[PDB]
């Protein structure tokens, strides 16, 4: 079968300074507020504004404070595997 609303997106940051997304926290509680020009995410094209960020390289964002999720994502930015939920 095919995963419909949970999708895996691989990004290679060797070519990009930044992800080019604004991440907001409101669990599914972290999501994409905007996608910016010139970043790894826009280049890939699969992630959309409003998608929820579930996982980055087997780190799950649930039970994570806001500072903690930034520090984690910061350190990670090898290939980056993002798991996002469309709904």
Numbering used by the authors: 260 to 285, 291 to 341, 345 to 354
Sentences reproduced from the published study:
The central event in Wnt-PCP pathway is the activation of Weak-similarity guanine nucleotide exchange factor (WGEF) by the adapter protein Dishevelled (Dvl). The PDZ domain of Dishevelled2 (Dvl2PDZ) binds and activates WGEF by releasing it from its autoinhibitory state. Dvl2PDZ binds to both C-terminal as well as the non-canonical internal peptides. Using biochemical and molecular dynamics studies, we show that a unique “internal-PDZ binding motif” (IPM) of WGEF mediates the WGEF-Dvl2PDZ interaction to activate the GEF.
Additionally, the apo structure of human Dvl2PDZ shows conformational dynamics different from its IPM peptide bound state, suggesting an induced fit mechanism for the Dvl2PDZ-peptide interaction. A comparison of available Dvl2PDZ structures shows deviations with RMSD values in the range of 1.7–2 Å. Importantly, significant conformational variations are observed in the α2 helix and β2–β3 loop, which are part of the peptide binding pocket. This conformational variation is more prominent in the structures of human Dvl2PDZ, bound with different peptides. Interestingly, Sector 1 of apo Dvl2PDZ is composed of residues residing in β2 and α2 regions of the domain, whereas Sector 1 of Dvl2PDZ internal peptide (WGEFpep, WGEFpepQ8A and N3pep) complexes had residues from the β2 strand, β1–β2 and β2–β3 loops. Additionally, variations in Sector 1 composition highlight peptide-dependent conformational adaptation of Dvl2PDZ domain. In contrast to the earlier study by Munz et al., we observe that the α2 helix of the apo Dvl2PDZ structure has limited conformational flexibility rather than having the ability to explore all possible conformational space, specific to the ligand-bound forms. Thus, our structural and MD simulation studies suggest that Dvl2PDZ adopts peptide-dependent conformational change due to its intrinsic flexibility. In short, we can infer that Dvl2PDZ may not have a preformed binding pocket, rather it modulates the binding pocket based on the substrate available for binding.
